[PDB]
Design a protein around this ligand. Structure first.
Ligand SMILES: *[C@@H]1O[C@H](CO)[C@@H](O[C@@H]2O[C@H](CO)[C@@H](O[C@H]3O[C@H](CO)[C@@H](O)[C@H](O)[C@@H]3O)[C@H](O)[C@H]2NC(C)=O)[C@H](O)[C@H]1NC(C)=O
Ligand SMILES: *[C@@H]1O[C@H](CO)[C@@H](O[C@@H]2O[C@H](CO)[C@@H](O[C@H]3O[C@H](CO)[C@@H](O)[C@H](O)[C@@H]3O)[C@H](O)[C@H]2NC(C)=O)[C@H](O)[C@H]1NC(C)=O
Ligand SMILES: *[C@@H]1O[C@H](CO)[C@@H](O)[C@H](O[C@@H]2O[C@H](CO)[C@@H](O)[C@H](O)[C@H]2NC(C)=O)[C@H]1NC(C)=O
Ligand SMILES: *[C@@H]1O[C@H](CO)[C@@H](O[C@@H]2O[C@H](CO)[C@@H](O)[C@H](O)[C@H]2NC(C)=O)[C@H](O)[C@H]1NC(C)=O
Ligand SMILES: *[C@@H]1O[C@H](CO)[C@@H](O[C@@H]2O[C@H](CO)[C@@H](O)[C@H](O)[C@H]2NC(C)=O)[C@H](O)[C@H]1NC(C)=O
Ligand SMILES: *[C@@H]1O[C@H](CO)[C@@H](O[C@@H]2O[C@H](CO)[C@@H](O)[C@H](O)[C@H]2NC(C)=O)[C@H](O)[C@H]1NC(C)=O
Ligand SMILES: *[C@@H]1O[C@H](CO)[C@@H](O[C@@H]2O[C@H](CO)[C@@H](O)[C@H](O)[C@H]2NC(C)=O)[C@H](O)[C@H]1NC(C)=O
Ligand SMILES: *[C@@H]1O[C@H](CO)[C@@H](O)[C@H](O)[C@H]1NC(C)=O
Ligand SMILES: *[C@@H]1O[C@H](CO)[C@@H](O)[C@H](O)[C@H]1NC(C)=O
Ligand SMILES: *[C@@H]1O[C@H](CO)[C@@H](O)[C@H](O)[C@H]1NC(C)=O
Ligand SMILES: *[C@@H]1O[C@H](CO)[C@@H](O)[C@H](O)[C@H]1NC(C)=O
Ligand SMILES: *[C@@H]1O[C@H](CO)[C@@H](O)[C@H](O)[C@H]1NC(C)=O
Ligand SMILES: [Zn+2]
Ligand SMILES: [Zn+2]
Ligand SMILES: [Zn+2]
Ligand SMILES: [Zn+2]
Lengths: 529, 530
């Protein structure tokens, strides 16, 4: 009978497809057809389509050939079981160590006169380098206010001197202003630097340009902050194409070796030997700023939904989660405490990665003191609960607003007051402050650039402390009180909220976001009606 | 604005490049060879068979996959869906019956005493090997044995019988000569319905020339022995090569089926009138009027078939034939005549939507449709149709006739139906039927003379007041109750040569459930068997 032939004909078919598109000419064909389709969907002008697709085609086809179309996979998709196996984005688990979990003990308020560690948090600087004042703020292009955007017609003004309120990342001068005005204050013990150094022009980006951004902005930070250590993390716009972060099992040229070795060449002064070693492989590391404290810098792109290399293998990329566990357990032993920093927050991640992270923080509550994440470009947080009943806040991650202005925001940075350096310190965020540059004032001719204080957390929300329970109570408190949420919304946008009023469903969506540290998991929002 | 928007265009371009890539013959060769190695890996069957069969399928197979499954997209509509591409493969469809209101139901009236009767001979699944060779190995490693190249049986196993064999072998032409020669007793026939499957079961090395050989020589044989009596054939699943390949009319030659359809109507020109030949050259189905007041429809069930891969491209009412059928059936309702439907594969072995639309049609046209005949099963059984609303009322039954061929351990056999005869007011419904078989245990003895015996008669054997559908329904549930009776139906099921295994309760249930399922993917139909 013929029924037996379907499977072999399928496997052979995708073998011929596989080896067939491994040749460049067909890759060119896919590129051009994709260009015509891009032109059909419009958004954006044709040259952008051309450049972007020419940039993506190679690695895109590479991964699809090695993942989606690899027979099989594909035959396991169309037939399944008997023929092939489709594992794409399959579930996986990281297997915590067998050490029994110590009983949860919440941290105690710091003793009077105890030391305090001030930490500067910079994220999403997004340096354009093509920013040109006077250009068109609203143009047809993924990014405007830069060389090649043209001029605004008639009554619409050009881009501001310090940056603009539409699209338009920052010119280097505004980063210089940010770093010069750091005095008051200040002084900082350390700086957490999340990533996203390059601008949002993703179609024509080049490795040389990305390296330019990384090295020059690193040099700027280093110039202004001097001896204070800066601990960076890898953002989602560092590599090119944007979001392309092949795990360590991909080897050059097309691997990430270039970016990871450009880093750790630039960050050599800040990071110790081991940190650099692990950074050269996967782009993540661990170190000890204080005795009794451990900082973990995670590469969240192996977390990312938009990182297509995960189609190939999405299972604990670079084995980093496991590594993290080894560290966190290493921290439980020794009686130390851990700070985690990263670009993309957990709960923006795929499915399994997020759940494994949640499982880890829940297991490691007493050890993990704080967590910091960027990427959102807006000011918000995320609350973690116990994995069983999800009724008890065990930790919170702080999502800091972007230094960049991207999509209509005032620039800003954050500063954390944290339990300081000494034995027994909890190393937990005591408070935080948010500075912004009001562009309406700063762009006036003759104005004096000023980085104002905006708000202080505890002062604004009346929190007895910054521990998770307080943020939980703040969320449910805002569900009820609309004025309070209006405050949180004003600060959410760094003082430049949009024109749309953000009515009731908007509020509900936002608060639900504040409560979801685990991707999917709709139940986390159950108590919000 | 980010890469996430590009996935769709990159996909569509990807599968365009794949499409044009495997549109070249060298790549087709590569897929063929990989498939050959895989076949050898799964074993079953010997390597030469794998090689030949895949070499026969590869061309058209790649054609269809390129044009359907992999056509971007489709494929992209599968991996992304909705917003990007549309995946319709084996999607639902409906035939839209005409708006004429259904006439009020009513049972056919019993024929008056002394009324005329039309005897019809039903031949199906002749499966002529032409390579059948007595003495060769009946059980060999091969899809088909008892032929040239099967070798000799080792040691104690005897060879193949002169008149055919009881394991995995088709018929030699001489046994078809025997069948057609012994047709006298009895009786005289008014017409002959011939379902299909003329060529043998060797599907790996088949060639168009061979299939046409079978068609023309066997057609010539039937015409020789039955002479002036009309034979209305149908297209079986073994005609075209590769087996089951029946591209709809929207596929054009060379690789289309026009060669087979025009080879027919060249061979069947004496039997079928002009229109029949015209539509048969297109779709392989036709309509004609054997009697005044009666209409015979011959459907090509390959557009029905699950095993026909050309439907991957478009599975929706191939050749628009179902619609055509409606147009004919309605034409009869206004005209007040009755319809006989014949085809190879029975409805309920068909895909999903085709089957359900067929059920809907027969249900709508019940009073008009007098009888239905189908082959393919190679075994003696039937299928009962119910009302589309409550599914409690049998509105019709289709008769699945046993095979003339011996394929898979059966005595050869043919059937003859007694039908309400030619006259005004005739119901044209099956009154009874008979089944003749050639017992090979006796016929293959040296010096024996092949004899085609009577086996059973329906009404007498099952004690049915008539052959109308209600009778067969009552028979099925009676068999659910009575195990001895089912044992009878099982003996006749195999044409008098039931297997060694006792069958029994789960077997019985499966068989009866099959008898009640005329619509594929209709498990509810068997609910009442518990
Ligand atoms: C239309 O399509 C047909 C199927 O693709 C194709 O039939 C093929 O014809 C060739 C040449 O006659 C045969 O060639 C093979 O077999 C013959 C006879 O055994 C040998 O002489 C050859 O060396 C070779 O082995 C194929 O067997 C035959 N395929 C089948 C299965 O029918 C027609 O030729 C096509 N016609 C046109 C217009 O190209
Ligand atoms: C096809 O031909 C077969 C051989 O003629 C025949 O099988 C034979 O059937 C008879 C009985 O019909 C068996 O003889 C039996 O007779 C006594 C009578 O008292 C029984 O008690 C015994 O069971 C005894 O078996 C033969 O033994 C048997 N021979 C073989 C080879 O099986 C089939 O019945 C015929 N089948 C059809 C469908 O006609
Ligand atoms: C290595 O990395 C990628 C291939 O994955 C490729 O882009 C490099 O070649 C350069 O890439 C530039 C874009 O980033 C492109 O604009 C430039 O023309 C091209 N050529 C060079 C030498 O810069 C690959 N280069 C290597 C090391 O072969
Ligand atoms: C954290 O505090 C400890 C003291 O509690 C500091 O360690 C001292 O460092 C000085 C040199 O600057 C040595 O002379 C002392 O002997 C050290 N004492 C101990 C107990 O280690 C440490 O410098 C502080 N860490 C940071 C980063 O400021
Ligand atoms: C940023 O600057 C603008 C202008 O200086 C502030 O908006 C002003 O708010 C006052 C409140 O009474 C109004 O009377 C003015 O008309 C506003 N000016 C304009 C042109 O909008 C704005 O509040 C500042 N943002 C913050 C809070 O830092
Ligand atoms: C599949 O085939 C049919 C033609 O048989 C295509 O369009 C149908 O054609 C019939 C007859 O002309 C019309 O009466 C129907 O209305 C049509 N149906 C639909 C759903 O459009 C149909 O487009 C083909 N589908 C594919 C996959 O191309
Ligand atoms: C069906 O019966 C009809 C009569 O109802 C038969 O037709 C007659 O055939 C004879 C012999 O040729 C003619 O003399 C008559 O003129 C015919 N009458 C009509 C009205 O057709 C016919 O023989 C039967 N048909 C078949 C196929 O048996
Ligand atoms: C087809 O596949 C099944 C296993 O899925 C195998 O057991 C069987 O032998 C194959 N069919 C034939 C006719 O060999
Ligand atoms: C993905 O990585 C994990 C961890 O090594 C391992 O199962 C294997 O390398 C990959 N799984 C696959 C290829 O399915
Ligand atoms: C593994 O993680 C998944 C999420 O990816 C979670 O739903 C599941 O409970 C875990 N599975 C096992 C077998 O522990
Ligand atoms: C593609 O781009 C446009 C404009 O950036 C956006 O509105 C749209 O949502 C994108 N496509 C999808 C499917 O989201
Ligand atoms: C008729 O088509 C509709 C969808 O338009 C579908 O829901 C229904 O099941 C179809 N009817 C049949 C008998 O398939
Ligand atoms: Zn960013
Ligand atoms: Zn980012
Ligand atoms: Zn058959
Ligand atoms: Zn058949």
């Amino acid at each position: 009978g013929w029924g037996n032939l379907t499977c072999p004909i399928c496997k052979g078919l995708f073998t011929a497809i596989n080896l067939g598109l491994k040749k460049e000419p067909n890759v060119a064909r896919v590129g051009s057809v994709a260009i015509k389709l891009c032109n059909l969907l419009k958004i954006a002008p044709p040259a952008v389509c051309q450049s972007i697709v020419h940039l993506f085609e190679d690695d895109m086809v590479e991964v699809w050939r090695r993942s989606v179309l690899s027979p099989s996979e594909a035959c396991g998709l169309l037939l399944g079981s008997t023929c092939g196996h489709w594992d794409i984005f399959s579930s996986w688990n990281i297997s915590l160590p067998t050490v029994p979990k110590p009983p949860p003990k919440p941290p105690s308020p710091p003793a009077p006169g105890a030391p305090v560690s001030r930490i500067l948090f910079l994220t999403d600087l997004h340096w354009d380098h093509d920013y040109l004042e006077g250009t068109d703020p609203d143009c047809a292009d993924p990014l405007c206010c830069r060389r090649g955007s043209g001029l605004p017609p008639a009554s619409r003004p050009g881009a501001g001197y310090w940056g603009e309120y539409s699209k338009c990342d920052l010119p280097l001068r505004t980063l210089e202003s940010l770093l010069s005005g750091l005095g008051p204050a200040g002084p900082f013990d350390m700086v957490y630097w999340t990533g996203d150094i390059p601008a949002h022009d993703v179609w024509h980006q080049t490795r040389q340009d990305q390296l330019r951004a990384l090295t020059t902005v690193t040099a700027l930070v280093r110039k202004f902050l001097g001896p204070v250590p800066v601990y960076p993390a890898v953002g989602n716009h560092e590599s090119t194409p944007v979001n392309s972060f092949p795990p360590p099992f991909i080897e050059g040229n097309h691997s990430s070796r270039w970016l990871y070795e450009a880093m750790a060449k630039a960050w050599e002064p800040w990071l110790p030997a081991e940190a650099l070693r692990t950074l050269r492989i996967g782009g993540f590391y661990a170190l000890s700023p204080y005795p009794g404290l451990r900082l973990i810098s995670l590469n969240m792109n192996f977390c990312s939904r938009e990182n297509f290399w995960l189609l190939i293998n999405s299972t604990d990329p670079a084995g980093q989660l496991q590594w993290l566990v080894g560290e966190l357990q290493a921290a439980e032993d020794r009686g130390d405490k851990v700070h985690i920093i990263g670009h993309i927050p957990p709960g923006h991640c795929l499915k399994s990665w997020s759940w494994n992270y949640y499982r880890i923080v829940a297991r490691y509550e007493n050890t993990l003191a704080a967590q910091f994440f960027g990427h959102t470009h807006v000011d918000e947080f995320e609350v973690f609960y116990d994995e069983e009943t999800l009724s008890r806040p065990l930790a919170v991650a702080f999502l800091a607003p972007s230094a960049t202005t991207y999509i209509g925001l005032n620039p800003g940075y954050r500063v954390y007051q944290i339990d300081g350096n000494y034995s027994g310190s909890s190393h937990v965020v005591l408070d935080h402050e948010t500075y912004i540059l009001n562009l309406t004032q700063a762009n006036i001719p003759g104005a004096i650039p000023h980085w104002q204080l905006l708000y202080r957390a505890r002062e604004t929300y009346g929190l007895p402390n910054t521990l998770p329970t307080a943020w939980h109570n703040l969320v449910y408190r805002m569900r009820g009180d609309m004025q309070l949420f209006q405050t949180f919304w004003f600060l959410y946008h760094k003082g430049h909220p949009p024109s749309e009023p953000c009515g009731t469903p908007c509020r509900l969506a936002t608060l639900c976001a504040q409560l979801s540290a685990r991707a999917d998991s709709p139940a986390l929002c159950r108590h919000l009606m």
